Amino acid sequence: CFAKGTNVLMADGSIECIENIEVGNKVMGKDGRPREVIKLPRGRETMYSVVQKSQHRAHKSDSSREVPELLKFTCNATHELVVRTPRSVRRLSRTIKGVFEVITFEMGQKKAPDGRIVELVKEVSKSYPISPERANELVESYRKASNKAYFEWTIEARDLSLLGSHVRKATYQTYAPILYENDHFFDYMQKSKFHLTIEGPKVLAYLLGLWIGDGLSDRATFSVDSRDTSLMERVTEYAEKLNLCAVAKTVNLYSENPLWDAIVGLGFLKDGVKNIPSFLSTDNIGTRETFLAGLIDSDGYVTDEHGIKATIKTIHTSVRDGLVSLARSLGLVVSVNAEPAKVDMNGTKHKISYAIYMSGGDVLLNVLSKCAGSKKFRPAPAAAFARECRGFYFELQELKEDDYYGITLSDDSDHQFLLANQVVVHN
DNA sequence: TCTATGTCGGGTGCGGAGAAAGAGGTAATGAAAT
DNA sequence: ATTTCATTACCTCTTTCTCCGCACCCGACATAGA
Ligand SMILES: [Ca+2]
Ligand SMILES: [Ca+2]
Structure with missing residues (x-):
């Protein structure tokens, strides 16, 4: 249950305003697969502001300094945040009224303002008299009771407050990479020009890349640093590959040129200026x-x-x-x-x-x-590397009792979709 | 008369290295609840 | 007798912000195609 206008990330890849989602369309599942909508929960209630935290300081001092776009959404007070939290354990040692210890983040319960008994994480202490292997064991265990280095759990806005102080800070949300895959770059190419294939879409993309950075805003031509040979070469090699020819320098690519019929076709140049x-x-x-x-x-x-x-x-x-x-x-x-x-x-x-x-x-x-850059290149990751959802911390600010727009996912799914911004949310 | 691609002049983008600010993580420390 | 919690001060880790000029770009126009 979000706020009117909140942009969602439709399954097909598109983007729509929550306030338009019709029963029977498909939102974007965090894994790249469709999530069918069936119920469209509507109504009013007190809203909540969720916005990422960032070491951004500029605006605070000076005004009219543009506010940073920063990952946020506005949901109802009962909405379930899809949060995450580290499994920590530190051996603190202390002295009370006269006379070790083991503090950990554990999966627990706590009483709400109402009867409601909410699940969540709490800091748990447990220490004996200084008067050895205990505290050790009291830890090794916690370290070997799971693989996950975090707890994946949900919590409704209105309950965050019940969160401890240590835990509350350690707790973050996430935004998943877009794993969905369209082939609008592929189908285009084949859907046109007498092309040469096998790496076509590749060298194309690379060039489409360069151009954006160092490429005149009126034609398929671009600058390159003469000093960087690898680059010098990459363009050459790649140019050749696309079946075209070759301080600072401008390099033109002559054969009715593919590149241009890309910088245009896919709209890399929008009515005059550049644009990804x-x-x-x-x-x-x-x-x-x-x-x-x-x-x-x-x-x-x-x-x-x-x-x-x-x-x-x-x-x-x-x-x-x-x-x-x-x-x-x-x-x-x-x-x-x-x-x-x-x-x-x-x-x-x-x-x-x-x-x-x-x-x-x-x-x-x-x-x-x-x-190819002499100074840009970096050897590829040895083995498989993470493409895991990225975490972020956040502020939550109480708000006005306003209207909400919602969608409920099939009575048999992860119940988690991606908001246009790519932040994981619970339906 | 109407679209690409030499090529020429004034002026701006952004190239490049860091240091420092924030964020949460760690520990310390005191007083209350259990 | 422990175990619960906030808060505070400092350490670790990344990420915001800045400082400033000259060489690379954008803008234009001429000219070859058609
Ligand atoms: Ca550039
Ligand atoms: Ca450059």
């Missing part, structure tokens, strides 16, 4: 990743200082947003920084600069391995 089309967020993952590599080789530097990551820049909002979702559909974590439209004495006019940040170790490394 939406569809891309829900097409063959690989494709996605490639398209990213390109964009990373083109414009975005990489570092490992504090764990692998890649920062991309740009001033067109279209690209901003577009990149955001795409990276977010890949299960990469992403935050956006915006630089003001400063005007300097050195006589210059600067516009609002957006710097998109991305991280995720193994998930990212799988992108960077497909890159």
Whole structure:
């Protein structure tokens, strides 16, 4: 039971406003599979604000500094949040009125304002007199009573408050990568031009990538750093592959050019300016990743200082947003920084600069391995790497008793779908 | 007369490295509930 | 006699924010096609 206007993520990949979902359509299941709707719960009740927490500070001090889009939804007071919480245990040692210990996060119960007995996690202490192997055992056990390193459980907004203090902070929600896979990049290509296949959609994507970053906004041409040979080469090789030919430099690709019939066809360039089309967020993952590599080789530097990551820049909002979702559909974590439209004495006019940040170790490394940049590339993950739903902490603020719009999932499903934003919610 | 692709000039985007702020995790510590 | 909880101060880990100029881009126009 959400708020009127809350954007959902339809099964086919689309996006619709909860307030339009008709009984018999299919929302997006966290695993990529459809969730059938049958009941459309409606009515009023006190609402709740759920918004992610972020080390964003800018707006607090200065006003008119754009507010950060940040993952949020507004549900009713009884709605079940799909939360998660770490299984922790620390051996604290202490002295009371005169005279070890083992504190843990356990699965427990607690009394609500009403009779209601809600399940949830609570900090549990248990210690004996200093006057050895006990506290050890009292732990080893907790460590060997499960594989999961967390508890997956649900809790209604109105009950979060009953949560402890330690636990309450340790508790976070999640947003699942978009595993669904459309083939709107594939069918397009084949649905057109006298193409050459086997890696077609690939090199295409990579180039489609570059272009976005370093590519003139009126034709299939682009800059490349002469110093980076691997890149220099990748374009060459790839160009050849697509069946086309070749400080800083501009490289043109002449054969009636495929690339252009892409930058147009799939709408990478929208009525004049550049833009990472939406569809891309829900097409063959690989494709996605490639398209990213390109964009990373083109414009975005990489570092490992504090764990692998890649920062991309740009001033067109279209690209901003577009990149955001795409990276977010890949299960990469992403935050956006915006630089003001400063005007300097050195006589210059600067516009609002957006710097998109991305991280995720193994998930990212799988992108960077497909890159050519001398300084961008990173060897692919040895074995299989996680593409697990990403967690996030959040604030909850009480609200107005307003109307709610809801949908109930088939009496036989995970009862969890993805909101357009990709945050996992319970029906 | 009307679409691509050389190529030329003023000015802005964003390239690049870090340091520092926040967030939650850890432990410490005191007083009340069980 | 433990076991329950908040809160506080500090440590760990990532992620926001900034600082500033010059070389790379965008914008334009001419010109070859058609
Ligand atoms: Ca660029
Ligand atoms: Ca570049």
